[model samples]
Target chain A: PIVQNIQGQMVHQAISPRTLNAWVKVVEEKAFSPEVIPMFSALSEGATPQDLNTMLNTVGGHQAAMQMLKETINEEAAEWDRVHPVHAGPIEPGQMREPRGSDIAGTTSTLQEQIGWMTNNPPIPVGEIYKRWIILGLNKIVRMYSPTSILDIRQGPKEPFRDYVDRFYKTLRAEQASQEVKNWMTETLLVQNANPDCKTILKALGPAATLEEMMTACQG
Target chain B: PIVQNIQGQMVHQAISPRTLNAWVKVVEEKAFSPEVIPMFSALSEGATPQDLNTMLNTVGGHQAAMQMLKETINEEAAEWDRVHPVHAGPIEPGQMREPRGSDIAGTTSTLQEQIGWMTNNPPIPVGEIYKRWIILGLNKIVRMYSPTSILDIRQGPKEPFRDYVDRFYKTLRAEQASQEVKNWMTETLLVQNANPDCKTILKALGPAATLEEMMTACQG
Candidate 1:
């Protein structure tokens, strides 16, 4: 039902419901045309008709909506390619390479190349090309660098108190540790409270001890 | 030598002669950056500073000149590619495929695809994108159907006067034949004016025989 509605949106809002349904019918009947594959791929994502309507409203019209949809599909496809790692030819599973920092750089370069190509031999709207470039670039950055869940900050045996605190603070910073994670880390550090004097100092510092305060208290 | 002026025009008008020469000096004495190659390609065609100036005057200013220059280079490059096809990998000479009717169709379809893509995600100015699509489409049509020379319409062996005139008129009509070409065709047709009845008709029709009148007389 969701798929049907999405298909309807892709048809009515995008191509023409008649054209889309005809295409779908053709596909179902196993008639192959290179023409509809792009349409199919453009509609392959999970965007609902409602999502299409909202985006259309936000983008300000129908053509803009189609352009946005195409970009969304392209971006989604690129992400899927990153995750699944499609190979060059024989469909050799697992042979696909993982994307690296250099790969991010490569994607940026390729995007730039495409943009440059578009400037002279433009294949899309100039603004759309720029928008796609920015979105894809930001998406890549978010993928590569956006923080995940906080690391376990509990102290380990043989790791120095100061070293443990440093590692914990690094993870907290890197992971964008939530207030809860920070509090848990602080509580954990206090429990592991390496120096006898630290417990005394922390007790004085009270329940709201900042990481910096906790470190200072531990040192003092 | 011509290239020097062209290069100077490329440097001065498009980028900046002062900036480009300095960079060229840096490269020759040797210290450079990657930003210069595009300038090189943009400069690759034979657009002189005079041509730039004329276009600038005609177009109304510098930004318009720059935009005009960029489009000129792009169209030139596309045209060059049609003549000498480039293929994948190393630029092995002659590996490029010849431009064919299908290639023209492919280009039109790609342009259509891009226009379709732009309808959804337009980046360049909307009217500009539409202008470009129309220009490129027309350019492709001209490439496929344009008369390169007068010989394209010259009489074929064993073809009758009426048939030859018909073919000649078709090409002239198709291409908006130049006045010179038209005059030459008229003179040539008169010399080859094989039909005695058609000649008598033409004499009665008078000396100021229009290409259309000549055709009509031949048909009659």
Candidate 2:
């Protein structure tokens, strides 16, 4: 048993990881992460004024935590090397696969709009605040595969079109998709292709003769 | 300023909501909800043995808190009256809209598979736990309209097929989609239709002559 006292008053009667894990297991079946679980497991609600204040300050306060949560969610996965890995998915009645770079960034963008909406609607509930904060923070890790997000790949600066082509192909290759879908993507991914020289470069290529060629043309 | 002491040491020198909110404001510009923001504002980390234990046990400990999060997430908006109102969206390069019941449930299902996959991979980072968790919970409130998810409506056993049809129509009507998409859904929502009397009832109706009729047949 772990005993915690605030000003000689027992704040938390006492608890342990084993006991806590059991309690958590009683309600949920998902295996949780170790980094934040202990911190989460350690948290209690409706504490005394001082105790609660202690909690908020211990990790730079809830306000900062929530802000940090937002900042984290808004970060670009392409730049953050430590970012969580994303994969493609079979959302429902489908299979969820590992994520892609675009999946990670794109999903967060989707989530960003969702959060962006909430921020606009102020005087939101405290419970709702934490809920959004926690969700936006954790979901950063896994970006599942969504067919619609395929063309979202970006070409890095200084990278030639050929190399960009290879990278984009790998992005599609990671998904368990059909050749029809693959071919569809292969031939016209350049529709949204953004680059300085893309207009003249792709215009010079004329129509592509192969899926690979089209994919290459689309790599601008 | 709030003064908090643990085991005779000033665990948190003292922090006020005003100060904390200022810190939070430094990172985020979004207006936060009132429900759980206070709780978030009062928390601190790396407390003494008793303090950390107090945090874990304060509410029900992180384990239970997280479980509560999952259980809350898995609850049906269609059933649980307290569930958040979901909306449709233009995630990126698009506008966000209010959610539908099916949108709410379907997105959760999508999120469910996501969390489901996470649980299978154990020893996940603690940071990741809360990240996924917070996201799954908060997203429950908003189920944006996705053209792909438009057909996932369900009918109640007691719900007359007519009423079910009306409800399904309302679900689609809420979206700012195209007539092509709307007409597409109006004509074939019954493809994934689930109901006991659906086969006989819908069979008797036979090939819908109008979008309304097709939607009605799908109500089964």
Candidate 3:
């Protein structure tokens, strides 16, 4: 009643209900609007001159606004300290839980790279195929998520290592990135743990028994 | 000879200082980040058995962040009662100078369309050819600028009479968009004026009337 298979080999089955609750405690992630990735791809070609310029200026302004908000939140939360909220997830297919910090930033980084590639190639608009135009819209989303600096969470005096890593992974994993992106993330995240400072700090924490141990503990 | 024709008749003997300025502006707008767009394209290839869920999740989270920032600005600006600021432009290009409302919602409507198109197409790789990715980054700007319903200045208070448009045309003629984005900006100060409310408002503002508008008034 659980697993399904095509020919002879066994296929992976969905997790049982009893274990689901336990899994939720580990990964705190969320589902996103699937439409956004493709929508980003179309932003360039379809936009008019005024729309384009206004859009660019808007981003600079958005960054400023975020900073303003952050300051406000810090003040507000400081008036009464904001709790370090723990995020968790459900272990079900097609059920998107909220991603932790690392994933989110990582996803954004990947999305950025994909957009960067499309912009450079300028899409191929042959006979019936509007490649160039199509590629342009794709460029929009990629650019939005590109800057990792924006994803940095430098608020806490000392947040949990797991929460920090989760933030990174959540950002990266959630991004609508390309293959190059996955490769890039895998390398960076793995290397991030390998950093001398990261290693030394984690080792001092006494939880990092090995590199994998360090990453797993932090990434949770 | 200010102007000239080639071969059979006359040719351009000397360029006007105005022409020189126009050319410089055009070139400047074209410059944008090279890496971002191309990267987006490379990832959309469907060669791997990747998690589509991750893509959806990331898109949603980023959008949430964007919306959060947008709502904040609109709320605070409204509370301060500082919705409308003035914009002005050059007179030499025939631009009219005045204090107009500040353009809020840096092109949010166009961004919505971009989102709509992407929703229909799904995940297409975004390319950088014409700085498409940069355009996507601007969505949040518009959200913040026009955070509140009342403070929107991108469009004027009401529609301009069709016959009265010429009064501004002289102004439009005097104004010049940066050459890089001329194709996009046109007379609307580089923002889409398609929305009815927005159109009504734009009718009241003199179109960028000259080369000197940027220096004289209508500065962002």
Candidate 4:
């Protein structure tokens, strides 16, 4: 949605203070040079006990901060990739899951046989659909809004409003997919990927699992 | 020498108006839109030969004003490079005459025309050695005392001043050859070569033709 006027003026101006150099200045001032050294002080500026203590504190703090930053960026990168549907699709093809012995395995095992253990089994449910449309939408939004600088950096929610017209159509295509698979692939994502979310959504076709684990393994 | 505290600060502070965008409103004036065209009376708004001529003249006058701006910058650049030796030195180095054959030609004809040119033609007289030293010293002092930019750009002119130091010392090394070779080069240069005023100076060595021809023929 980048736009310009007739005279070639850009619609959006880059915010300067959010740039890397400004961030570096802020980090150095707050984190490293917190206090100006007193010229009049008689204390040793060399490697004395006080100097060693300050050095150790800075080193320890810096290491921990760097470790946390690495972990955050790794997770953020994973989320960033999800913004583009092309980047988020599964690498493998769909596999069919026939009902298995494990579907009722423990109910009648040798150890549990004496107790007719399966009598207490909760109601078994079959064929639940986990939709991927919302995740796909999120991926598209994030990819579009990625910031070059941290200060003007976007958080999760905001997306360019002009894309709403297409987004409405995208949502409609997603809703139609469960009723007919071909429509889902064609109307929305065929332009992006030949193979759609079938492999992933189909995972929920057979087994019953915790909602958290299902979302984590697929959404992540 | 361009001290960091002086000319470097001055050059750094120098700002040019060309970097800023100006008078953008004229292009986007609301009154000139197509929707507003019918508001004017038909007789007055319609174009005629006299009106068209006046309009063209007005446009031409505006263009001259813009051209005058280019002249202003060139004028300022010349003046800025003159009084401040720190600013002047590097520009002079860049303007150094690229050595060419025309510089060294006609020497043989001059030598033949005046037979015993060596004996009759006087040896090159040395200018007051102390006078040149005092001139260079006074130039450096003036550079140090010069006022920095009144409108600071990126802090000061210190960095540009250092560039002048690098240029000056390198120029001196190129021109001041060993004492023994100095007289031989001088005698040949003055008696045989056509340009009487030419010398090996900080800005340039001998004219292009003389140096290149000498290096090639005298190497063996």
Top candidate on TM-score is 1
- Sorted into a CAPRI-style docking class, model 3 comes out as incorrect
Ranked by lDDT from best down, the candidates are: 1, 2, 3, 4
- Per-residue lDDT of A152 in model 2: 69
Which segments of model 1 are wrong by more than 4 Å? A1-17, A21-220, B1-137, B140-164, B176-196, B211-216
- Candidate 3 error regions (>4 Å): A1-136, A145-151, A155-158, A170-212, A218-220, B1-152, B155-188, B191-220
How big an interface RMSD has model 3?
26.3
A217, model 2: CA deviation in Å? 19
lDDT of 3 by residue, B33-133 (tens): 22112222222212111111122223422365345544554454354345544333344442222211111222222333322222233422211211232
TM-score-wise, the better of 2 and 3 is 3
| lDDT (tens digit, per residue) of candidate 2 on B63-173 | 222333334533444443346454445455433233333333233234323222323334222223333334444333122212224556776667677676666665564
A140-206, model 1: which lDDT tens digit per residue?
3333343333333445444545565544443343343455665466465544545555656777766
Comparing 2 and 3 by lDDT, which wins? 2
Each candidate: what lDDT? 0.40, 0.39, 0.32, 0.27
- Name the weakest run of 10 consecutive residues (lDDT summed) in model 2 chain B: B139-148
Q: Candidates' DockQ values?
A: 0.00, 0.05, 0.01, 0.01
What is candidate 3's lDDT per residue for A83-193, written digit by digit as tens? 434355556664333323222212223433322222233421121112232233323333333435324533243555656656666566445568877765544454344
Consecutive 10-residue window with the lowest summed lDDT within model 1 chain B = B56-65
Compute the lDDT of residue B74 as modeled in candidate 4: 32
Interface RMSD values, listed in order for every candidate: 28.0, 16.2, 26.3, 30.2
Angstrom error at residue B151, model 3: 15
Error of 2 at B36 (Å): 16
Q: Per-residue error at A129 for model 4, in Å?
A: 55
Considering the two chains of model 4, state its CAPRI-style docking category.
incorrect
Off by over 4 Å in 4: A1-10, A13-18, A22-220, B1-169, B172-209, B216-220
